[PDB]
Each structure stands twice: as structure tokens, then as C-alpha cells.
Design a protein around this ligand. Sequence first.
Ligand SMILES: Cn1c(N2CCOCC2)nc2cc(N3CCC(CO)CC3)c(NC(=O)c3cnn4cccnc34)cc21
Ligand SMILES: [Ca+2]
Length: 292
Amino acid sequence: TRFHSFSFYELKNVTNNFDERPISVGGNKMGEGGFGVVYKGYVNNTTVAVKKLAAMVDITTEELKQQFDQEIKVMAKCQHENLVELLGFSSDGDDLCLVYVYMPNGSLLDRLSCLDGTPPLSWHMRCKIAQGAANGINFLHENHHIHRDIKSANILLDEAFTAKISDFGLARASQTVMTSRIVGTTAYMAPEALRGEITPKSDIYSFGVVLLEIITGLPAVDEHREPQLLLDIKEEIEDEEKTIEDYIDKKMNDADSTSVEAMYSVASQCLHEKKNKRPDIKKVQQLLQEMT
Ligand SMILES: Cn1c(N2CCOCC2)nc2cc(N3CCC(CO)CC3)c(NC(=O)c3cnn4cccnc34)cc21
Ligand SMILES: [Ca+2]
């Protein structure tokens, strides 16, 4: 649709030359992913987020350019309150930038870790974010898209903490197909996604890991933790050596045992090791509505 084509130099100006100091300290850097660093800027009185694309994981310059074109294509087709909105881009010279509507509360990953001293999210807000994120995935699946990169760093939060799915560079139009290029964040990936399969069933699995991060406040992976992988707590609970109560985030005072167990039951189902036994996104969405 109408995306503004900026010149790279204009984005160089709005981000104070992609100032690498964190925004918490007066710089412009907000964070980063496998495909680039994201910065704050102001364009014509509008606060914006600017991604300066870079192959920060093991992908080629040509693959990074295809991911750029793909994100624009997905954004032109998909608009929904639980999806990030693209405003523009720059593709002049050898640089690639994406310009988005700014998300005042950053990522769900950072809000769960209370990065930069932000207050812990209440259980009530955590439930609305889970619902919002499921509505976003539902919209994408309804519209024949597989996200392929679902994780709490890719769930953003606006001024009212409305969940906004981000990063559509790996998204694929959707019969299970295979790929030779296995790309993603291991800690969130379904076993079949780790084998190169492409299916919306893998989006559900990754959403299952997100639901565990919401309940526990723990990251999906921590090398200095036992177990290193959060998804492993499902087996510990099933083997009855632990309960979800032993893992619930202690940085909340409004979590009731009934809705916590209802969210865990949704997470446990999304995390079924066999893709065909997982619920589809419409079922995930109904269960999270019944929970509240
Ligand atoms: C304001 N703010 C803050 N605060 C500092 C702490 O106190 C609350 C406000 N941290 C933010 C982090 C991000 N991201 C950086 C990249 C990351 C990995 O991709 C995810 C989080 C954003 N980001 C956006 O506004 C954004 C908007 N569309 N978009 C698309 C892809 C990535 N980011 C965006 C804002 C932040
Ligand atoms: Ca003015």
C-alpha cells in the first residue's frame, strides 16, 4: 500500500546517525534482532522505529534483500491492530531500512525481564497480551501466512500494552513443504521446523514457548540455568517432579491459580511434540478467551 520511500540520508538524520547508545541513556538504539539493529527517531513530529537491516545471523546479502522485499509485501497485504504497521523504507545505495509506527512499551521479552527498570507486568495485563498475540497469529493464518519467527522479542507493546506481532521477513504464503535454509531462534523452534519443514503448526509451538515465558517471566534459553531450555519445564511438570506453581513469576500479586493453570494447559497443548496433535490458532484463541 502507501509506504513512503525515504532516502537513506533522511533516516541517517532522524536516528542521529544510527546513534548506538541506548535510548535509556539519551541515544537512539532500542534493540536488535538477527536481521538488524532498531533505532528511535522523529520524522515530521512522528516518533518512529527504524530498522537498519544487516545479516547479524548466518544469512547472505541476497537473502537479506529477499527478506526486506518479503516484509514489505506482507505489510502491504496484512493490517490488523495486533500486527506492527510499516510506514516506509529506504533502498537507495547499498543500505536497506524499514520504518515502523513506534511501540512505546518495546518488546514483551524486555517487559518480562523488566529491562531498564520498567515495572513487572500484572497477571491481568499478561492475559490480555496473550489474547492479543493469538489474535495477531489468527489474522496471519486466516490470511494464508506462516510467520516462522514467533518469539517474545517479536511481540511488541504499544502505549496501552496492546500486543503487536513484528518481523515478517521470513513469513511464507501457505500441504507441509520443506526448505534447505533452516533459519530461526532455536529456543522457540518446533522439532519439525528444526528439520526444515514449513507449516503454520510450528507457529503454534513457538507461541507455546511464549506462553511459558509469560507465566514464569523466565527467558526461553539461559545457558547458566537448569534446565537451559524453558520448553523442558513441560516434561518436568508431566513427570510430576514439578508444578506450574514452582515456576510462576513471583513479580506479580494478582495471579489466581485457576487462570494460571488454564494458560499453562494452553501452553502444554501448543507444545505437543507431534505437530498434528497441537491445537490450531482458532482453538488457541477460544481457550485464551475462556480463561478470562
Ligand atoms: C520504546 N521502546 C523501548 N523502551 C525502553 C524501555 O522502556 C520502555 C520503552 N524499548 C524498545 C525496544 C524496541 N524493539 C527494539 C528491537 C527489538 C528486536 O526486533 C524489539 C523491540 C522498540 N521497537 C519499536 O518501537 C518497533 C516498532 N516496530 N518494530 C518492528 C521491529 C522491531 N521494533 C519495532 C521500541 C522500544
Ligand atoms: Ca510543525
